[PDB]
């Protein structure tokens, strides 16, 4: 049994959102749904749910901002009725939320802003390769000036994971993000090894792979 | 009137 | 209802023990109705006790609930490296007399090591790529570091800037409780050309004095 959440995007304020909680492998009937968010970096909220009653339950705070409602048999809908950019949260959808059969789903994010989709430009962060630090050599790629988040990063498909560390993206005074991804490598392999970041920037329908090499 | 509960 | 956890933030040993309160403004549903809830970073909540008490199948024995009514604890034994999350109360309340739910604002758990770990640290010139466009990212790593604190300072042709620099840090590792950190100085091309000498200096625990990396362009 299974939950998940859909329709997170960036929305201008005041245009109205419906995000989408779809379930798996159990009656929605039987059990009680719920939707929680969270600001980016910062609490768990209980915005409202659906009892096994039928009946539909709002947090104080959430009244007048929010409805949610059977939409069909395996879908629960949460509209935002008029997005403001303290809405910028990811909003998770939720089977129970104590008892055992409780499941959450990975949560879908929403973007309250008036800016653009922005696609990132990709950089190498070329290895030094100037002499060897005890034996490894760091590389990486510079994913800079994006809107909205979120952007992710792998290193040759996936096939290398060992070493990587994708940093917390930066909002810059421009409004736009950046991050690094870096990964640590035996230093013997840079003239042998090819090093490829791959870039996904689903917001914005990019996707980059950069080849990252000795200078 | 029975308790509602949403867990 | 209101609940107000505390403190806020822990930063315990590994193997010791870390206890996180809980207190509601009014009393939860049959005087035990408080789950507690883990959160690490990108992941969704997962449910380690209900019922104040009884813990969650799949959780370990490690995690202790205890309490009653308005005023609840959970106790982390024999801490864990993987441990490192934010821990969130859950009351819940009869929806006919009061919010049927309610989270605490959340409690970090951060973990501390004996042995400290010096970063190893890399500079990186902008690429002829980004110049092209008119900006220069430089950028300084500091990897795998133990304790978090740590200071870098960037210098052109010697003088210490300010105000043209951003850090990102990781989550602590929770595997070997490392840290890395990322620090951006963005200039213009212009003054990028103008200079000489781009240096990233450090000073962390494990360092015997502060490092320099620096380029001229051309549990």
Same mark, same amino acid.
């Given at each position: 049994?299974?939950?998940?959440?859909?329709?997170?995007?960036?929305?201008?304020?005041?245009?109205?959102?419906?995000?989408?909680?779809?379930?798996?492998?159990?009656?929605?009937?039987?059990?009680?749904?719920?939707?929680?968010?969270?600001?980016?970096?910062?609490?768990?909220?209980?915005?409202?749910?659906?009892?096994?009653?039928?009946?539909?339950?709002?947090?104080?705070?959430?009244?007048?901002?929010?409805?949610?409602?059977?939409?069909?048999?395996?879908?629960?809908?949460?509209?935002?009725?008029?997005?403001?950019?303290?809405?910028?949260?990811?909003?998770?959808?939720?089977?129970?939320?104590?008892?055992?059969?409780?499941?959450?789903? +990975?949560? *879908?994010?929403?973007?309250? =802003?008036? !800016?653009? /989709?922005? $696609?990132?430009?990709? &950089? %190498?962060?070329?290895?030094? @390769?100037?002499?060897?630090?005890?034996?490894?050599?760091?590389?990486?790629?510079?994913?800079?000036?994006?809107?909205?988040? +979120?952007? *992710?990063?792998?290193?040759? =498909?996936? !096939?290398? /994971?060992? $070493?990587?560390?994708? &940093? %917390?993206?930066?909002?810059? @005074?421009?409004?736009?993000?950046?991050?690094?991804?870096?990964?640590?490598?035996?230093?013997?392999?840079?003239?042998?090894?090819?090093?490829?970041?791959?870039?996904?920037?689903?917001?914005?329908?990019?996707?980059?792979?950069?080849?990252?090499?000795?200078? | 009137?029975?308790?509602?509960?949403?867990? | 209802?209101?609940?107000?956890?505390?403190?806020?933030?822990?930063?315990?040993?590994?193997?010791?023990?870390?206890?996180?309160?809980?207190?509601?403004?009014?009393?939860?549903?049959?005087?035990?109705?408080?789950?507690?809830?883990?959160?690490?970073?990108?992941?969704?909540?997962?449910?380690?006790?209900?019922?104040?008490?009884?813990?969650?199948?799949?959780?370990?024995?490690?995690?202790?609930?205890?309490?009653?009514?308005?005023?609840?604890?959970?106790?982390?034994?024999?801490?864990?490296?993987?441990?490192?999350?934010?821990?969130?109360?859950?009351?819940?309340?009869?929806?006919?007399?009061?919010?049927?739910?309610?989270?605490?604002?959340?409690?970090?758990?951060?973990?501390?090591?004996?042995?400290?770990?010096?970063?190893?640290?890399?500079?990186?010139?902008?690429?002829?790529?980004?110049?092209?466009?008119?900006?220069?990212?430089?950028?300084?790593?500091?990897?795998?570091?133990?304790?978090?604190?740590?200071?870098?300072?960037?210098?052109?042709?010697?003088?210490?800037?300010?105000?043209?620099?951003?850090?990102?840090?990781?989550?602590?590792?929770?595997?070997?409780?490392?840290?890395?950190?990322?620090?951006?100085?963005?200039?213009?091309?212009?003054?990028?050309?103008?200079?000489?000498?781009?240096?990233?200096?450090?000073?962390?625990?494990?360092?015997?004095?502060?490092?320099?990396?620096?380029?001229?362009?051309?549990?």
């Amino acid at each position: 049994q299974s939950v998940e959440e859909s329709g997170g995007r960036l929305v201008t304020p005041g245009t109205p959102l419906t995000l989408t909680c779809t379930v798996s492998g159990f009656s929605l009937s039987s059990y009680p749904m719920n939707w929680v968010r969270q600001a980016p970096g910062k609490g768990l909220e209980w915005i409202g749910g659906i009892g096994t009653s039928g009946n539909i339950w709002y947090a104080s705070w959430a009244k007048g901002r929010f409805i949610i409602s059977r939409a069909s048999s395996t879908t629960v809908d949460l509209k935002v009725t008029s997005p403001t950019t303290e809405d910028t949260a990811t909003y998770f959808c939720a089977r129970g939320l104590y008892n055992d059969y409780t499941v959450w789903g +990975p949560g *879908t994010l929403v973007t309250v =802003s008036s !800016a653009s /989709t922005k $696609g990132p430009s990709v &950089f %190498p962060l070329a290895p030094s @390769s100037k002499s060897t630090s005890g034996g490894t050599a760091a590389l990486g790629c510079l994913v800079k000036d994006y809107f909205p988040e +979120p952007v *992710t990063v792998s290193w040759n =498909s996936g !096939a290398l /994971t060992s $070493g990587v560390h994708t &940093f %917390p993206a930066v909002l810059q @005074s421009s409004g736009l993000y950046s991050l690094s991804s870096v990964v640590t490598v035996p230093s013997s392999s840079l003239g042998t090894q090819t090093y490829i970041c791959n870039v996904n920037h689903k917001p914005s329908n990019t996707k980059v792979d950069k080849k990252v090499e000795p200078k | 009137p029975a308790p509602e509960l949403l867990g | 209802q209101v609940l107000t956890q505390t403190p806020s933030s822990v930063s315990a040993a590994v193997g010791g023990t870390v206890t996180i309160n809980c207190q509601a403004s009014q009393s939860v549903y049959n005087k035990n109705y408080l789950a507690w809830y883990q959160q690490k970073p990108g992941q969704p909540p997962k449910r380690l006790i209900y019922s104040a008490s009884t813990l969650a199948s799949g959780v370990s024995s490690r995690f202790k609930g205890s309490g009653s009514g308005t005023q609840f604890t959970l106790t982390i034994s024999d801490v864990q490296c993987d441990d490192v999350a934010t821990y969130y109360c859950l009351g819940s309340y009869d929806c006919n007399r009061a919010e049927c739910h309610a989270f605490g604002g959340g409690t970090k758990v951060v973990v501390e090591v004996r042995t400290v770990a010096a970063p190893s640290v890399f500079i990186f010139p902008p690429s002829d790529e980004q110049l092209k466009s008119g900006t220069a990212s430089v950028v300084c790593l500091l990897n795998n570091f133990y304790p978090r604190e740590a200071k870098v300072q960037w210098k052109v042709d010697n003088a210490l800037q300010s105000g043209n620099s951003q850090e990102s840090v990781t989550e602590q590792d929770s595997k070997d409780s490392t840290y890395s950190l990322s620090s951006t100085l963005t200039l213009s091309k212009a003054d990028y050309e103008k200079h000489k000498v781009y240096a990233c200096e450090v000073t962390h625990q494990g360092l015997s004095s502060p490092v320099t990396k620096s380029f001229n362009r051309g549990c």
